[PDB]
Amino acid sequence: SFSGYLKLTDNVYIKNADIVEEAKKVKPTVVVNAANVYLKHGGGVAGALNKATNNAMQVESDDYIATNGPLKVGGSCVLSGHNLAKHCLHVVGPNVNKGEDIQLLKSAYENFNQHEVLLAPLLSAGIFGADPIHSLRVCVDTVRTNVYLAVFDKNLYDKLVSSF
Ligand SMILES: O=C(O)[C@H]1C[C@@H](O)CN1c1ncnc2[nH]ccc12
């Protein structure tokens, strides 16, 4: 039920929207979380998605880490989407503020190819410190499945479209 998106390529679409509000409206099969390896959902997209689940995402995530240990940077796991989606794909992009290899951003986006359609944010952008223009380029050159990107910041959305 996606509406109001701008088409960038055959399979990539973009909209100026809060991914939480978009998930509540659409209830997609998969919402992507901008996760860290510990699944500690404190701020940014992860903090906002978790708060919309009334902390149920963090309780589920703590049980997953207690059983499996941390994810790899560039890796992912599929957990419940709670009241927002059928599933949440938690994907770890590199955090440039922590010195992580930006080359891992392509490996992070490759996780999206296991799902036919996804609602997602730009990986490694925002508080993860990478250039969002670079993140959008890696997304369109890596993802082959249908990805609906939600960009919260209006000024960033306008810059991403104008420079595409
Ligand atoms: O604007 C953006 O593209 C990124 C980076 C930063 O502005 C935060 N953010 C988000 N993008 C989409 N839905 C969001 N919900 C909560 C945060 C958030």
Curated annotation (Swiss-Prot):
Organism superkingdom: Viruses
Reported impact of T29A: In strain: Mu/B.1.621
Subcellular location: Host endoplasmic reticulum membrane
Domain Macro: 1-164
Notes on activation and inhibition: Inhibited in vitro by GRL-0617.
Reaction catalysed by this enzyme: Thiol-dependent hydrolysis of ester, thioester, amide, peptide and isopeptide bonds formed by the C-terminal Gly of ubiquitin (a 76-residue protein attached to proteins as an intracellular targeting signal)
Membrane topology, as annotated: Multi-pass membrane protein
Subunit structure: May form homohexamers. Interacts with N protein.
Function: Responsible for the cleavages located at the N-terminus of the replicase polyprotein. Participates together with nsp4 in the assembly of virally-induced cytoplasmic double-membrane vesicles necessary for viral replication. Antagonizes innate immune induction of type I interferon by blocking the phosphorylation, dimerization and subsequent nuclear translocation of host IRF3. Also prevents host NF-kappa-B signaling. In addition, PL-PRO possesses a deubiquitinating/deISGylating activity and processes both 'Lys-48'- and 'Lys-63'-linked polyubiquitin chains from cellular substrates.
Protein name (Swiss-Prot/TrEMBL): Papain-like protease nsp3
Organism: Severe acute respiratory syndrome coronavirus 2 (2019-nCoV)
Residues of the full protein shown: 1027 to 1190 of 7096
